[PDB]
């Protein structure tokens, strides 16, 4: 049905990625990968 | 049905990406990849 | 049905991307990739 | 049905990733990978 | 049915990952990998 | 006086291929009958 | 006086291919009968 | 006077392949009949 | 005067392959009939 | 004057393969009929 | 529909030859540095 | 549909030859540094 | 549909030869440094 | 559909040969440094 | 569908040969440093 | 020095000759080939 | 020094000759081949 | 020194010769092959 | 020194010869092969 | 020194010869092979 999301604070740095066959996520809320 | 999202603060830096066969995400809310 | 999204603040920097066969996203809300 | 998520604070740094055949996540809430 | 998650604070650093055939997660709440 | 070779090339030939595909969703990567070297 | 070679090229030939595709969604990458080297 | 070789190339040939696919969801990587070397 | 070789290449040939796939969910990696070397 | 070889390559051939797959969930890794060397 | 080949021909190349002859009597046949196929 | 080959030909190459001959009497046949196939 | 081959041909190459001959009487046949196949 | 081969051919290569001959009388047959197959 | 082979051919290579001959009388047959198969 | 030859009677027939690297002779008297 | 030859009678027939690396002779008197 | 040869009668027939690396002779008198 | 040869009568037939590395002779008188 | 040879009568037939590395002779008188 749905999402209620708030007041999230994120900082990030990503170094080299070869092959992302999937999920590289800071915060993942109910997603499908 | 739906999303209610707010007051999110994000800063990010991404280094080299080779092949992104997927999701590289700061915050992912209910998405499909 | 729908989205209600607000007061989001984002800053980002992306370095070289080879092949983006997917999603490179700061914030993704309910999208399909 | 759904998610109620809030006041989350995240900082992260990722070093080189070879092949992400899966999930590399700071916080994962109810997602499917 | 759903998730109620809040006031989480996370900091992390990831070194090189070869092949992530699975889950490398700081906090995982009810996800499926 | 010496011989130096890099023969890192390739050859493909006598092949018979039938490739049939039904509905495809996001094709994030590849569906390949036969792949000979290369990078997706 | 010496010979130097880089033969990193390619050859493809006697082939018979039938490729049939049904509905395709976003094709983010490739659907290839036969791929010989190269980069998608 | 010496011979030096790097023959890290490849050859593929007498093959008969039938590849049939039904509905595919996100193809994050690859579905390959035959893969000969290479990188997905 | 000496011979030096790196023959780290490859050959594939007399093959008969039938590959049939039913519904596929996220293909995070690969479904391969035959894989000969390479990296997914 | 000496001979030096690295033959860490490969050969695959007379094969007959039938590969059939039913519904696949997240394929985190691989389903392979035959894998000859390589890395998933 | 079929391929038919007779490749009974020839190739000769990177060669360095020094040929010196002193008095020759009846040369009934041949004095050859290098002979590649053929008939005397 | 079938492949038919007769490759009864030949190749000769990286060679260094020094051939020196002193007085020769009737040469009934041959004096050859190197003979590769053929008929005298 | 079948493959048929007669590869009864030949290859010769990295060679270094020094051939020196002193007085030769009737050469009824042959004096050969190296003979590779063939008929005298 | 079947493979048929006659590979009754030959290969010769990395060789270093020094051949020196003193007076030769009737050479009824052959004096050969190295003979690889063939008929005198 | 079956494989049939006659590989009755030959290979010769890394060799170092010094052949020196003094006076030869009728050479009815052969003087050979190295003989690999064949018929005199 | 010399030859004294007489009253010789010869009849001959020769079939195909491939390569005559030598002597094919009915009567040879003191010759050099 | 020499030859004294006489009253010789010869008839001959030769079939195919491949390679005559030598002497094929009816009568050979003191010759060199 | 020499030869004194006489009243010789010869008839011959030769079939196929492959390689004559030598002497095929009806009568050979003091020759060198 | 020499030869004195006479009143010789010869008839012969030769079948196929492969390689004559030597002497095939009806009558050989003092020859060298 | 020499030969005195006479009144010799010879008839012969030779079948296939493979490799004559030697002497095949009807009558051999003082020869060298």
Residue numbers in the entry:
A (entry chain K), B (entry chain O), C (entry chain S), D (entry chain G), E (entry chain C), P (entry chain Q), ...: 8 to 40
F (entry chain P), G (entry chain T), H (entry chain L), I (entry chain H), J (entry chain D), K (entry chain R), ...: 1 to 40
List sentences quoted exactly from the publication behind this structure.
Adult individuals with Down syndrome (DS) develop Alzheimer disease (AD). Here we report the structure of Aβ and tau filaments from two DS brains. We found two Aβ40 filaments (types IIIa and IIIb) that differ from those previously reported in sporadic AD and two types of Aβ42 filaments (I and II) identical to those found in sporadic and familial AD. Tau filaments (paired helical filaments and straight filaments) were identical to those in AD, supporting the notion of a common mechanism through which amyloids trigger aggregation of tau.
Type IIIb Aβ40 filaments have a width of 12–16 nm and are composed of four protofilaments organized as a dimer of dimers (interface 2), with each dimer similar to the type IIIa Aβ40 filaments. In the two inner protomers of type IIIb Aβ40 filaments, the density at the N-terminal region was resolved due to inter-protofilament interactions, allowing us to model residues Asp1 to Val40. The outermost protomers of type IIIb Aβ40 filaments are composed of five β-strands while the inner protomers are composed of four β-strands. At interface 2 of the type IIIb Aβ40 filaments, the two dimers interact through their extended N-terminal region through a hydrogen bond between Glu3 and His14. In type IIIb Aβ40 filaments, the extra density around His14–Lys16 coincides with the interaction site between the two innermost protomers of type IIIb Aβ40 filaments. This extra density, probably a charged host factor, interacts with both the disordered Asp1 and Lys16. Type IIIa Aβ40 filaments (~3.5 Å resolution) and type IIIb Aβ40 filaments (~3.8 Å resolution) represented ~15% of the Aβ filaments. We were unable to observe the three fibril structures reported by Kollmer et al. but rather determined two structures composed of Aβ40 filaments formed by Aβ peptides ending at position Val40, types IIIa and IIIb Aβ40 filaments, which were reconstructed at 3.5 and 3.8 Å resolution, respectively.
